[PDB]
From a paper:
In this work, we show that unencumbered views of the changed, non-ground state can be obtained by recasting the problem as a multi-data set, 3D background-correction problem, which allows the relevant signal to be extracted from conventional single-data set density. Our new method—Pan-Dataset Density Analysis (PanDDA)—comprises: the characterization of a set of related crystallographic data sets of the same crystal form; the identification of (binding) events; and the subtraction of ground state density to reveal clear density for events. We demonstrate the power of the method by applying it to the most demanding type of changed-state study, namely crystallographic fragment screening, which attempts to observe in electron density the rare and often low occupancy binding events that occur when a relatively large (200–1,000) library of weak-binding ‘fragment' compounds (150–300 Da, 100 μM–10 mM)1819 are added individually or as cocktails to a series of equivalent crystals. Applied to a series of fragment screens, PanDDA yielded markedly more hits than manual inspection of density, far more quickly and all with high confidence, in both known binding sites and new allosteric sites.
Author numbering: 1856 to 1970
């Protein structure tokens, strides 16, 4: 509350550390469905159904330009990419499997870097 704060957790390396995680997600062999925005002209239904499209290149640009206020808003966008994927793709598809795999890969790196 006013003049009552928990001890100050050091957040000075968060930017650099999120950048490293995102590099690792970008270079994963199963990243290919997620590297670029879904083409809303060429994929029927996507625009209407997925209210908030997100992809790795859009996260990279937001990160590099100071549009994440803290590490939690970064994680929310990464999770949005996988939540979108699950909304549009059957589990038993190459893309649906890719999204599950990448979500796991991310959540481990997230815990090991910060928790």
């Amino acid at each position: 509350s006013m003049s009552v704060k928990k001890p100050k957790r050091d957040d000075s390396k968060d930017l650099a550390l999120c950048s490293m995680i995102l590099t690792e997600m970008e270079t994963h062999e199963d990243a290919w469905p997620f590297l670029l925005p879904v083409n809303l002209k060429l994929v029927p239904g996507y625009k209407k159904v997925i209210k908030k499209p997100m992809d790795f290149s859009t996260i990279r640009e937001k990160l590099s330009s100071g549009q994440y206020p803290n590490l939690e808003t970064f994680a929310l966008d990464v999770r949005l990419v996988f939540d979108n994927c699950e909304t549009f793709n059957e589990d038993d598809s190459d893309i649906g499997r890719a999204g599950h795999n990448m979500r796991k890969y991310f959540e481990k790196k997230w815990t090991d870097t910060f928790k």
